[PDB]
Nucleic acid binder design. Structure first.
Ligand SMILES: [Mg+2]
Ligand SMILES: [Mg+2]
Ligand SMILES: [Mg+2]
Ligand SMILES: [Mg+2]
Ligand SMILES: [Mg+2]
Ligand SMILES: [Mg+2]
Ligand SMILES: [Mg+2]
Ligand SMILES: [Mg+2]
Ligand SMILES: [Mg+2]
Ligand SMILES: [Mg+2]
Ligand SMILES: [Mg+2]
Ligand SMILES: [Mg+2]
Ligand SMILES: [Mg+2]
Ligand SMILES: [Mg+2]
Ligand SMILES: [Mg+2]
Lengths: 29, 46, 111, 41, 26, 97, 189, 176, 109
RNA sequence: CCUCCGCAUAAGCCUGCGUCAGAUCACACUGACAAUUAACAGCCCAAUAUCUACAAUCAACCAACAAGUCAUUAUUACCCUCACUGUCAACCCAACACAGGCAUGCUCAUAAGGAAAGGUUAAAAAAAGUAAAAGGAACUCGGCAAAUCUUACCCC
RNA sequence: GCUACCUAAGAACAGCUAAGAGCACACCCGUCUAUGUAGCAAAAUAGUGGGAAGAUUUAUAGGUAGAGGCGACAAACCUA
RNA sequence: GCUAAACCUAGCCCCAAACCCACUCCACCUUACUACCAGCAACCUUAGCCAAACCAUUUACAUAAAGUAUAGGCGAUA
């Protein structure tokens, strides 16, 4: 038997969304 | 005010609103659990 | 027994006797400093309290004094490569108390 | 896909080989090469 | 994987032109 | 970058196959088979365009009226949507009117 | 184990197996069949091709899933084992897999590699026979118990006096327990 | 006593306990029912001995000295329960002529599907049972659209399954 | 607020945690004071055979002989239950009058 | 040096700073192993009849109006006896190890529970405070803010 | 399950002066300024305030649904 | 020279032919995955976007006869 080490496991994590309409503001009437 | 805490949970209001007997007690609600059995949902209802 | 139909008892029917009992048990070492006479068993979920008292008085013939069970929950947080939760099975734990001070100590297996 | 393009790289290289002596991102990017190498000719 | 042979062949030949430039034979 | 490095495996094609040698055989079966058959009847494949060129719209209409009674539930909806779109497109859109 | 599982030289239950093939690899599978399978565990076979061709030797392991045999000590390459450190450890010759239809079966007295059929013999019934010569080549290739094994005497006693008496009753008859009370009928639906 | 939960004290840390040859069920079909009722209680006293060894070897992180005999005593258990089930089911066929010891009926649920509904052994007739009236065992015919839509889904999976294997056999015949 | 997780007794409020339980195969009932009444007749008693004076052991030897499988058919049991049914040249009609009913199954395991 | 908090219960969450091993602002994550023990709390009742005008407020005067939050009896039936479940945590809802939301009993300033400052320098501009000669609204849309307590009147 | 209104059975209102009374905690609301504007936050923080034994405030469960619900009408509110 | 790049095979799509599948144990209409007690029950034309350049009747859901007879703000179109 050839000796070895422990096992590991790693991945990523992603998500996305859309916040709101946006940005209340004002202008010239 | 602060407005992200719209889900104030309780198991009674979950089960008596979106539970299996709630989905089954209505003829218009059986087809919901049928659409989910058709799509193959791992969680049919709550 | 486990995973079976129980014949319903009405009022004056026969005593429900079991033969070829399905459930198996295991004795463990308690790690959080248990007293003498108190020995810890790992019980399948569908097994009541007196179904251990009659079980020990039947098969192993041990003077059981006081049984106390408790369901310890299984850890759900473990995710595969497909990122799905795998839940270790929860199980019952019995803290059997022995009579007459018979005082079982847990032996040193793998000495 | 049926009949997708395969030899894009040589069509890019034909343009870039006349713009190879440039400055900035004109010499490496294709979209900025044709807006200059056309003006070069 | 595109369905081609001619473009991959032209690339494989052009790489020979680049190898003879990077390390020419004596 | 799109261009593969290694050249793909070389394609062998044996042109003396059974199918590649017997292609075209038994065509012109009516004109020198004393007109027992028609070469539209050597056509094999779908049930509707067994010898009928048509359009895309014309093929969809014929496929509906020869098959659609036994077509699948989502597909019948998907073909009815297709004809409901193509009847709009061909008669109300495009150049030349 | 998953579908599309490449079978290495490791068994399916090794630490080396779960090094080489964790559950999330989906490599392209290998191609192969035909259950009249004539290469067995411990046969003496002759490698036709590769390196070290023309040699005859014993097959120590058959892996049916990739249609592999591995001959003993042959078609080899030298690997290192352990080495645990920046020192060499030990070198061991390790044997490559041999493809089926690369390797044939040798006649036991003619000592030539042949091909092998399955004719139904009158002796009963089907042993692998050689093509060119006749000479049926066989299927080739201390315990005494302890405290919790029975015997050979005690496993074949024929205790079964074979009556129609419903084991939960046959026990209770001889155990002496006397139930007087009667079971009342339950609405079974 | 409680000392039956471990073996004799000579085998603690041996890394192998030499005992094989589980009970194949041919060797139980010849034994009588009283012997089987005793042997079950033998095997149950042994499975606890091995299961203690399991959760203790997990505690002390050593391997099990003999893991291969856990499946052997399990093979004995499944042999014994199967042959007792053979005798029970044969005698039941002689006495009542029915298989399927728990009574039930082929029944249609709400969702059109034809299940085998096993009965639940109550103590009043079913026209008096307030829970059993609330279970509806019928079609209520709007579900037939979904019945068609799932019948076609099963067929689409079956069609993809067969058409994969024909293309696999063609590429194997174009390999050999 | 999970939909895939197993609804067990640990989840709901104090009127859900005592209501579900596990597969306990319960014993008695509740009487007028939240007073549990343990019916002894529903507690399963364990009919254990005495094992002192037994020959067999949990394993067999490897030296035991091999035999082909003998699926015990119902006719095969008839082939030994018919042994005194030839000298006339052992059966029960109904099961309601048995302590140990077979098809409306009355025993346990 | 803080404490505008803390400990419980309910609710929610479901092993989420226990032990060993590991790989990688700084070393609650991964793997394995252990655990929360009922007496607290749930989980309740055998019928069929028939019963129950005078509140609570320290209930005593005394005052009420908006008129109130608690109960049986008769006969029949009954002698099996203490199972099941919750019991962990630094946590819940806010996409976050998020100055927010969070019901109740205590604690009414604590016996709990905590750490505003990674280090240097002490420029601008900015923010939050402290102080100010003389003047005291002269600023400004307006005493807005800040400081201190107050005079009087319109309109709606 | 947020919110409008309602139903069931519940709960809290320190202290001081003497009643949809007054001062003032808890509590609830959000006047005004400042900070912040990809923020601590998809409406927040610090002061300053308004009511705080009632048309109060709030936990629990239940109901009313879009051609509608509900509304002390802001054409509000009904999962940002 | 790093980031990287390349890669056949998983499978799949279209048809043909052929009509398909429900009991290993226990649990699953109450809060589905709950051993265990005296009440009710299904059948109702689609509408509208769109075209008519608005919109208001109207507006498509083998081959050949044939886009023929007919219908239609006699028009869109059927
Ligand atoms: Mg606690
Ligand atoms: Mg947020
Ligand atoms: Mg402290
Ligand atoms: Mg700090
Ligand atoms: Mg500093
Ligand atoms: Mg700093
Ligand atoms: Mg001054
Ligand atoms: Mg001011
Ligand atoms: Mg007031
Ligand atoms: Mg408001
Ligand atoms: Mg006030
Ligand atoms: Mg209002
Ligand atoms: Mg208005
Ligand atoms: Mg229009
Ligand atoms: Mg237009």
């Amino acid at each position: 038997a050839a000796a070895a080490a422990a096992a590991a496991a790693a991945a990523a994590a992603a998500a996305a969304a859309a916040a709101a309409a946006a940005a209340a503001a004002a202008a010239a009437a | 005010k602060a407005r992200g805490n719209e889900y104030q949970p309780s198991n009674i209001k979950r089960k008596n609103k979106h539970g299996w007997v709630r989905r089954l007690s209505t003829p218009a609600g059986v087809q919901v659990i049928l659409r989910r059995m058709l799509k193959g949902r791992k969680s049919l209802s709550h | 027994a486990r995973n079976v139909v129980y014949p319903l008892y009405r009022l004056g029917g026969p005593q429900l006797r079991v033969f070829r009992t399905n459930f198996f048990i295991q004795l463990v070492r308690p790690g959080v400093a248990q007293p003498e006479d108190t020995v810890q068993f790992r019980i399948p979920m569908e097994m009541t309290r007196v179904d251990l008292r009659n079980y020990l008085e039947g098969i192993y013939n041990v003077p059981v004094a006081a049984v106390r069970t408790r369901v310890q929950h299984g850890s759900n947080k473990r995710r595969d490569h497909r990122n799905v939760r795998i839940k270790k099975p929860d199980y019952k734990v019995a803290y059997v108390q022995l009579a007459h001070g018979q005082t079982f100590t847990f032996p040193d297996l793998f000495p | 896909l049926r009949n997708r393009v395969t030899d894009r790289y040589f069509r890019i290289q034909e343009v870039l080989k006349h713009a190879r002596h440039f400055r900035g991102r004109k010499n490496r990017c294709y979209r900025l090469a044709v807006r200059t190498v056309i003006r070069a000719f | 994987v595109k369905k081609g042979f001619r473009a991959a062949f032209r690339f494989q030949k052009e790489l020979e032109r680049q190898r003879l430039l990077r390390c020419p034979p004596p | 970058i799109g261009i593969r490095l290694t050249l793909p495996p070389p394609k062998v094609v044996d042109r003396w196959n059974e199918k590649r040698a017997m292609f075209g055989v038994y065509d012109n079966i009516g004109i020198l088979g004393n007109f027992e058959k028609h070469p539209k009847e050597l056509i094999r494949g779908p049930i509707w365009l067994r010898g009928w060129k048509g359009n895309e719209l014309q093929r969809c209409i014929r496929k509906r009226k020869m098959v659609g009674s036994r077509m699948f539930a989502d597909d019948l909806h998907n073909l009815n949507k297709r004809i409901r779109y193509l009847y709009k497109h061909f008669n109300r859109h495009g150049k030349f009117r | 184990l998953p579908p599309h599982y490449r079978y290495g030289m490791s068994p399916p239950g090794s630490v080396a197996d779960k090094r080489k093939n964790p559950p999330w690899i989906r490599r392209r599978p290998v191609v192969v069949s035909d259950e009249d399978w004539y290469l067995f565990c411990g046969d003496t076979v002759e490698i036709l091709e590769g390196k070290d061709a023309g040699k005859q030797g014993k097959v120590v392991q058959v892996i049916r899933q990739r249609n592999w045999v591995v001959v003993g000590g042959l078609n080899t390459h030298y690997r290192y084992i352990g080495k645990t450190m920046d020192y060499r450890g030990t070198m061991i010759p390790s044997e490559a897999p041999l493809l089926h239809r690369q390797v044939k079966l040798v006649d036991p007295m003619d000592r030539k590699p042949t091909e092998i059929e399955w004719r139904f013999t009158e002796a009963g019934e089907r042993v692998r026979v050689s093509t060119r010569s006749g000479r049926i080549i066989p299927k080739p290739e201390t315990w005494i118990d302890g405290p919790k094994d029975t015997s050979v005497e005690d496993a074949l006693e024929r205790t079964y006096v074979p009556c129609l008496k419903t084991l939960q009753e046959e026990v209770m008859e001889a155990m002496g327990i006397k139930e007087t009370r009667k079971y009342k009928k339950v609405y079974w639906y | 006593g409680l000392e039956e939960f471990f073996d004799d004290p000579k085998n603690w840390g041996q890394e192998k306990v030499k005992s094989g040859a589980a009970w194949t069920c041919q060797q139980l079909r010849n034994k009588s029912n009283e012997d089987l009722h005793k042997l079950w209680y033998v095997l149950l006293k042994e499975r606890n001995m091995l299961l203690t060894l399991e959760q203790e070897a997990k505690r002390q992180r050593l391997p099990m000295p003999s893991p291969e005999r856990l499946d052997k005593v399990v093979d004995s258990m499944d042999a014994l329960d199967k042959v007792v089930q053979e005798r029970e089911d044969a005698l039941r066929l002689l006495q009542t002529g029915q298989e399927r010891a728990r009574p039930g009926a082929w029944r249609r649920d709400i969702f059109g599907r034809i299940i085998w509904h096993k009965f639940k052994q109550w103590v009043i007739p079913w026209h008096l049972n307030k829970r059993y009236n609330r279970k509806r065992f019928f079609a209520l015919p709007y579900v037939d659209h979904f019945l068609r839509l799932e019948r076609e889904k099963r067929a689409r999976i079956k069609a993809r399954k067969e058409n994969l294997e024909r293309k696999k056999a063609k590429i194997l015949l174009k390999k050999f | 607020a999970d939909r895939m997780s197993k609804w067990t007794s640990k989840r709901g409020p104090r009127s859900f945690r005592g209501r579900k339980g596990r597969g306990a195969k319960g014993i008695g009932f509740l009487t007028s004071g939240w007073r549990f009444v343990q019916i002894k007749e529903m507690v399963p008693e364990f009919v254990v055979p005495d094992l002192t004076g037994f020959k067999l052991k949990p394993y067999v030897s490897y030296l035991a002989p091999e035999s082909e499988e003998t699926p015990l058919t119902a006719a095969q049991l008839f082939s030994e239950a018919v042994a005194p049914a030839i000298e006339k040249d052992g059966f029960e009609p109904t099961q309601e009058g048995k302590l140990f009913q077979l098809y409306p199954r009355n025993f346990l395991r």
